[PDB]
């Protein structure tokens, strides 16, 4: 049912190991708890 990528260190750029991080987000009515740094001045 499923085959294998099988990369080599000589493949064309083409089919080369590419890492992917999908950062799905949420906006449910439940309170937000993930936020950015929120920089601060002096």
């Amino acid at each position: 049912p499923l085959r294998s990528y099988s990369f080599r260190p000589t493949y064309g750029v083409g089919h080369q190991p590419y890492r992917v991080v999908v950062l799905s987000f949420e906006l449910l009515h439940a309170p937000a708890t993930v936020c950015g740094p929120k920089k601060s001045t002096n």
């Binding site: 009515h29 439940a30 309170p31 708890t33």
Partner: protein, 40 residues
């Protein structure tokens, strides 16, 4: 969607006095509390 707990501890039916509970913890929890039970 926030779970808030206020608390106060005193040394002493219930006492016939006034004391205001202070904020202990607000937690972003997320559940929809409908029932509860004590643990001893």
């Amino acid at each position: 969607g926030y779970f808030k707990i206020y608390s106060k501890h005193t040394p002493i039916d219930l006492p016939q006095g006034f004391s205001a509970l202070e904020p202990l913890v607000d937690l972003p929890i997320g559940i929809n509390i409908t029932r509860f039970q004590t643990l001893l």
